């Protein structure tokens, strides 16, 4: 559910069955080192091995919340990538979930190149508009600087 | 008796004397203020406080035999003090058991006898209206009853002491409070008998209700006036909490409390240090650091006390989980040769890029670092060692490339680096970014920032911070 | 009987620390232990190197039947010669307690000039005593005693004398240099060479221009620098005396830098042979190494290793990671790029530098005045 | 605020007007008007310190007016004997 | 002044800022420093 | 007494706001006074005078000096001139008028 | 040496003459009272140390 | 740099002064 904050001060109540034994907590708690260190591969080749039964509406969330945050991630000033980048950025060689981001998002495949939109910012600031606030400051200076004796 | 009953006379009579003499007057003189001009901000009521923290727990441990401390309660068992003729009559007592206790010996202790010294004083004509003599003279038999530290058949005599006391305290915050308001000295004797009622239970078992009665002296505290109770009760509340290894944070984060306005420079320091632990185990460390500071820098006056190398020690791990570093051992202390080599050592290998001495100095250091009482450094430094490799070459270069970086950092993947980047970018390690077309990895573009709005909100700022410090420094002084 | 005795606190040094260096520093001050009559100060020297030898009950025998003999004359002096103040006894005193500082160890010197200091009305005499503490005091590099009796003689002997202190600038400087003050005032008092006689006052004289030469290259950049090291003339010869010290400092100034590594390197290797160069040889490579970068990257903005790469020196990788530690380090206000090749620097002009330390003496007094503020007002 | 001497005592001397009821009063503000920088304000102060409190044993207002007759100023002398006479 | 809250609580003179800019590379400066020539 | 003294406190409460007003509008008047004073000292110093010397000192705010044509006077001194400048017989100012240091 | 105002690019060949600011005088004189107000709120520091 | 620091530590020497002030005719009322 993406509480990173949650997940540290829920680690208080084990005095040692995180490291000696006890892969049920020693699991997850290899699994927040993975994404501190970097390895979005060791993410999914440690999905394929569970100690109890499968954890499977447990990945299909993790799934969930990896996939959107590199989707969030990659949608910015870029404007075109090959379905190579796609396929090194995200993974499976042609699923549905290509297909999945062609409906929802955009992403379209065309001459085997994909189109991603500029979502950058364009802002003509002047910065001499916000004088006002400016004279506020001046003269609430002198208001305190006076008027108490 | 030769040697050591030869100095055995000098002891007593003197420190009996002067002692005595002490507090006799400002108990004289906390009656007359409490009688008139209640105005006793600047009074003498918080130096004495500050005498029996430190002189009469460095001064005397026992009770104090040939009738020296032991002395206090067969000379204060014949009180009553209500008309002007009875005062008069117990200031005639007031010099005669002084003047026998001087001279010869009267009652004297013998480490079993605290029931008939506590109720026969605490009874025999006793008034409600002389309450600070009658606190201290509860409070005063509990400092060498915990420093006997004998440990038979005291837990229950330190109990009935301490509910007693508990029962005088409500006795005077409810009936006739008309102009006596002992709570400035009375926030730290509920503080120093609940650090006993703490210890007792700490040599023994674990401390619930001490902690339920502190809410209700909380609940019925906080809605007549804010006047460092709630400071000091908030502490006691949350000192357990977190010395709990379970959970009670959240208690903490809801704990809508935080305004107590003014704490004689002594508890907004302590209090400072726990809610920077909780912002820290929070992963706020911004605000965390910038008060775990404003602790330490706020009160160095103290010789090696523990707080100050507590607080030191959690600071400098706080720093390493940001990444920037200062020297720590340049006020090195006869406590500190303890202290300043792991982390030390711990500094060390973190900022440079190496790890089998890391894992080494982690597997020898590791039993200080459970007795610290820290255990969050197992996973938020494998985080910092991978990060302060990637933090070091974006400060370096400006331009490298990611088939480089993935050779410089002994990561054998030219696929990742790509990946760590857009973590350090998301992170706010650095602002770079990535052009993927062959491995482009740029970095920041322009220097001005002097006429740019920068330093005009900084000066804003200052200004009205120091004009703060101006007008708060103007009314504290005109008091004449 | 304090001449000889810096080279011995050398022969010492050189001997005790590297072990590697054994062969000749046995060879002469074993002839200077059996001379001087030198029979307190040599056992660690004699148990930090060797075993023993028999020489030690002939020399013990004489040093004390002279010091009796020493002993029955001072006596006999103030039992028969009654004259105090400074008198044929205050002569005897300083002669016993020279023979003392010469034979003898320190703390009987101490003793007997604390004793025969009281007894001294004049002021070159109490100049003289704090010219022996000094002496022994630098002999074992005691920081304490120093703090002590300098602060003795500049107020309250030093306001009498006229040009008896020149010997006590260089005292003063030669413990900056075993301490760590080798930057401002170490250059700056070194600066008037106008004593080149040696004696008990003044040391080795080609040392004390190759000392202040090394030292007068960290206190300032070129502010003119030019003018008191080169348009000098004093300091001229003697550098002209020496070509190895002249060829490092034409390198330096008129920015020959391939050749500079090798007059660096002669000199760093040359610093282990001396008995002060311990906060130098770790300090005084990589300043002047990165004093060396920051004037070459001034005046280029988009310099390229391509020319660091023959015309600085050799190599392309060792250049890149020293400048990648230096920046790291916190110096040389830089950038450097690997794959367009450019080390495109970003110096402040003149006004964010004004701005950053401005922004820093700031927030270190609201820091300050905050801090004293909780303090006061309980 | 204003600056007529005429109206800066005919204002000041209204004070015992206002507060004769209560002699606990006009001496807490004529004990710091009657040490006014121009005498108008010390004078008028004293004026209504005696027609504040009519015959009652004050030994306050009695020790206003002590340095209030001792003055330079002959008229400011002058009403503080007539306000130690009419207390 | 004590505050109630204490578990448990010269080689050099100031030479930490060298160190923790420089601990350990190479301070002999002569073999790789002054050698580069031979592998150029 | 447990009505009686509670309007009481109300009419002290509200009989010391309005002098703490007062007395924060007083001295917000006070001031003007005290700019003219600081104007009248600037004034009454900068203008065409003659130049006398230091003679002697009685005490404080009292001096003695004479002027260049003679006869020597007795006048006052101001507060503004430092008291650590006349030892000697130095040149000081006089006023036509007043003949005081100036 | 000072002796000409400019910069040069090894990447480019290009020599580049460019100017200074001439006004240095406000700041440099404001920073030197920084430290005299340093040393004040210093000697108050120890003043109000040994003494309440 | 002027109002922010000048300003404030005059202040500061006013609070040291009459809080000392304070104190001492306190401590010898009586």
């Known amino acids: 559910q993406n509480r990173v904050a949650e997940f540290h001060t829920e680690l208080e109540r084990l005095p040692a069955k995180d490291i000696q034994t006890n892969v049920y907590i020693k699991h997850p708690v290899s699994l927040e080192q993975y994404l501190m260190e970097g390895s979005y591969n060791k993410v999914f080749l440690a999905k394929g091995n569970i100690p109890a039964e499968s954890y499977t509406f447990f990945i299909d969330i993790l799934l969930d919340t990896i996939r959107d945050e590199i989707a969030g991630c990659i949608e910015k000033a870029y404007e075109k990538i090959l379905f190579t980048e796609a396929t090194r950025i995200l993974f499976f060689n042609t699923p549905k979930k290509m297909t999945d981001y062609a409906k929802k998002r955009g992403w379209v495949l065309g001459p085997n190149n994909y189109y991603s939109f500029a979502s950058q910012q364009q802002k003509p600031e002047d910065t001499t508009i916000p004088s006002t606030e400016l004279a506020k400051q001046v003269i609430e200076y002198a208001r305190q600087l006076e008027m108490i004796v | 008796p030769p040697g050591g009953g030869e100095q055995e006379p000098p002891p007593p009579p003197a420190p009996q004397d002067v002692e005595m003499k002490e507090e006799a007057a400002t108990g004289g003189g906390s009656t007359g203020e409490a009688d008139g001009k209640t105005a006793a901000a600047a009074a003498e009521h918080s130096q004495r406080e500050l005498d029996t923290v430190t002189l009469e727990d460095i001064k005397e441990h026992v009770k104090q035999l040939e009738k020296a401390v032991s002395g206090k309660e067969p000379r204060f068992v014949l009180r009553a003090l209500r008309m002007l003729p009875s005062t008069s009559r117990r200031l005639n007592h007031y010099v005669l058991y002084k003047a026998v206790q001087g001279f010869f010996t009267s009652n004297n202790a013998t480490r079993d006898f605290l029931l008939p010294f506590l109720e026969e004083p605490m009874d025999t004509e006793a008034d409600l209206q002389f309450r600070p003599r009658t606190g201290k003279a509860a409070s005063t038999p509990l400092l060498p009853e915990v420093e006997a530290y004998l440990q038979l058949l005291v837990v229950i005599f330190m109990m009935n002491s301490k509910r007693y006391k508990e029962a005088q305290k409500i006795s005077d915050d409810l009936m006739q409070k008309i102009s006596t308001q002992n709570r400035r000295a009375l926030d730290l004797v509920a503080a120093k008998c609940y650090y006993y009622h703490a210890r007792v239970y700490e040599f023994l078992d674990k401390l619930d209700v001490v902690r339920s009665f502190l809410h209700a002296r909380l609940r019925t505290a906080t809605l007549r006036h804010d006047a460092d109770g709630q400071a000091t009760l908030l502490n006691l509340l949350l000192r357990n909490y977190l010395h709990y290894s379970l959970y009670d944070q959240a208690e903490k984060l809801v704990s809508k409390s935080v305004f107590p306005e003014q704490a004689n420079n002594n508890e907004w320091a302590r209090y400072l240090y726990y809610t920077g632990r909780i912002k820290a185990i929070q992963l706020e460390y911004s605000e965390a650091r910038r008060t775990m500071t404003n602790a330490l820098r706020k009160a160095p006056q103290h010789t090696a006390v523990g707080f100050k190398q507590t607080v030191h020690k959690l600071l400098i791990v706080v720093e390493l989980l940001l990444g920037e570093i200062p020297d720590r051992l340049q006020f090195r202390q006869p406590s500190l040769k303890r202290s300043l080599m792991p982390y030390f050592l711990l500094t060390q290998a973190v900022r440079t890029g190496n790890l089998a001495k890391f894992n080494q100095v982690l597997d020898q250091f590791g039993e200080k670092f459970q007795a610290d009482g820290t255990y969050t450094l197992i996973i938020r430094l494998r985080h910092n060692v991978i990060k302060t490799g990637v933090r070091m070459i974006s400060l370096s270069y400006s331009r490298i490339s990611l088939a480089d970086i993935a050779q410089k950092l002994q990561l054998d993947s030219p696929e990742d680096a790509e990946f760590i980047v857009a973590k350090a970018i998301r992170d706010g390690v650095i602002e770079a970014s990535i052009n993927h077309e062959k491995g482009y990895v740029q970095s920041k573009e322009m220097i001005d920032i002097y006429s740019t709005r920068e330093p005009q909100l900084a000066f804003h700022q200052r200004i009205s911070f120091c004009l703060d410090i101006h007008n708060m420094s103007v009314k504290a002084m005109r008091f004449p | 009987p304090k001449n000889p005795d810096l080279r011995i606190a050398q022969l010492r040094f050189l001997l005790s620390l590297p072990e590697h260096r054994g062969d000749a520093a046995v060879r002469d001050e074993l002839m200077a232990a059996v001379r001087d009559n030198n029979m307190a100060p040599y056992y660690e020297a004699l148990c930090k190197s060797l075993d023993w030898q028999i020489d030690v009950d002939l020399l013990n025998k004489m040093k004390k039947a002279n010091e009796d003999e020493l002993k029955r004359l001072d006596e006999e002096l103030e039992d028969a010669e009654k004259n105090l103040g400074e008198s044929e006894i205050r002569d005897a005193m300083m002669a016993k307690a020279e023979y003392l500082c010469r034979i003898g160890d320190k703390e009987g010197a101490l003793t007997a000039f604390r004793k025969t200091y009281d007894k001294t009305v004049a002021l070159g005499h109490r100049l003289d005593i704090v010219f022996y503490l000094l002496r022994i005091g630098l002999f074992y590099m005691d920081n304490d005693l120093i703090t002590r009796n300098t602060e003795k003689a500049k107020s309250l002997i030093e306001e009498g004398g006229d040009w008896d202190r020149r010997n006590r600038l260089k005292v003063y400087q030669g413990l900056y240099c075993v301490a760590i003050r080798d930057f401002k005032q170490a250059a700056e008092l070194f600066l008037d060479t106008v004593s080149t006689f040696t004696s008990y006052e003044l040391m080795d004289y080609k040392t004390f221009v190759t000392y202040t030469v090394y030292v007068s290259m960290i206190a300032l950049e070129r502010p003119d620098l030019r003018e008191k090291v080169i348009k000098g003339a004093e300091i001229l010869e003697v550098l002209h005396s020496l070509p190895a010290v002249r060829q490092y400092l034409f390198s330096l100034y008129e920015c020959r830098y391939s050749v500079f590594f090798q007059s660096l390197a002669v000199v760093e290797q040359e610093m282990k042979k001396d008995w002060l160069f311990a906060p130098h040889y770790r300090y005084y490579v990589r300043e002047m190494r990165i004093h060396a970068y920051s004037q070459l990257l001034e005046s280029y903005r988009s310099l390229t290793l391509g020319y660091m790469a023959e015309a600085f020196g050799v190599g392309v990788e060792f250049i890149d990671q020293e400048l990648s530690r230096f920046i790291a380090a916190g110096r040389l206000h830089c950038k450097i790029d690997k794959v367009n090749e450019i080390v495109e620097t970003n110096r402040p002009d003149s006004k964010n530098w004004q701005y950053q330390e401005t922004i820093k003496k700031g927030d270190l007094l609201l820091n300050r005045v905050q801090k004293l503020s909780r303090v006061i007002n309980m | 605020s204003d600056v007529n001497d005429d109206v800066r005592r005919a204002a000041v001397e209204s004070l015992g007007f206002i507060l004769f009821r209560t002699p606990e009063q006009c001496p807490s503000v004529v004990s710091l008007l009657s040490e006014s920088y121009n005498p108008h304000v010390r004078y008028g102060a004293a004026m209504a310190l005696g027609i504040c409190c009519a015959g009652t044993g004050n030994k306050e207002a009695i020790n206003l007016l002590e340095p209030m007759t001792n003055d330079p100023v002959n008229y400011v002398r002058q009403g503080a004997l007539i306000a130690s006479a009419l207390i | 002044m004590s505050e109630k809250k204490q578990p448990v609580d010269e080689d050099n003179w100031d030479d930490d800022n060298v160190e923790d800019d420089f601990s350990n590379q190479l301070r002999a400066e002569l073999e790789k420093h002054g050698y580069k020539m031979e592998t150029s | ?102 | 040496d000072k002796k000409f105002h400019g910069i040069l690019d090894q990447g480019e060949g290009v020599l580049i003459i460019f100017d200074e600011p001439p006004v240095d005088k406000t700041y440099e004189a404001a920073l030197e009272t920084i430290q005299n107000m340093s040393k004040v709120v210093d000697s108050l520091y120890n003043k109000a140390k040994k003494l309440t | 740099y002027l109002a922010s620091l000048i300003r404030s530590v005059v202040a500061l020497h006013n609070l040291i002064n009459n809080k000392i002030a304070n104190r001492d005719a306190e401590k010898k009322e009586g």
């Open chain 6, 1 to 102: 007494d447990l009505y009686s003294r509670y309007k009481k406190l109300q009419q002290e409460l509200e009989f010391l706001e309005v002098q703490e007003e007062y007395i924060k509008d007083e001295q917000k008047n006070l001031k003007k006074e005290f700019l003219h004073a600081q104007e009248e000292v600037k004034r009454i110093q900068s203008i065409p005078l003659v130049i006398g010397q230091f003679l002697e000192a009685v005490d404080q705010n009292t001096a003695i000096v004479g002027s260049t044509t003679g006869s020597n006077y007795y006048v006052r001194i101001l507060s503004t001139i430092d008291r650590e400048l006349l030892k000697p017989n130095a040149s000081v100012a006089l006023h036509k008028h007043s003949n005081a240091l100036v």
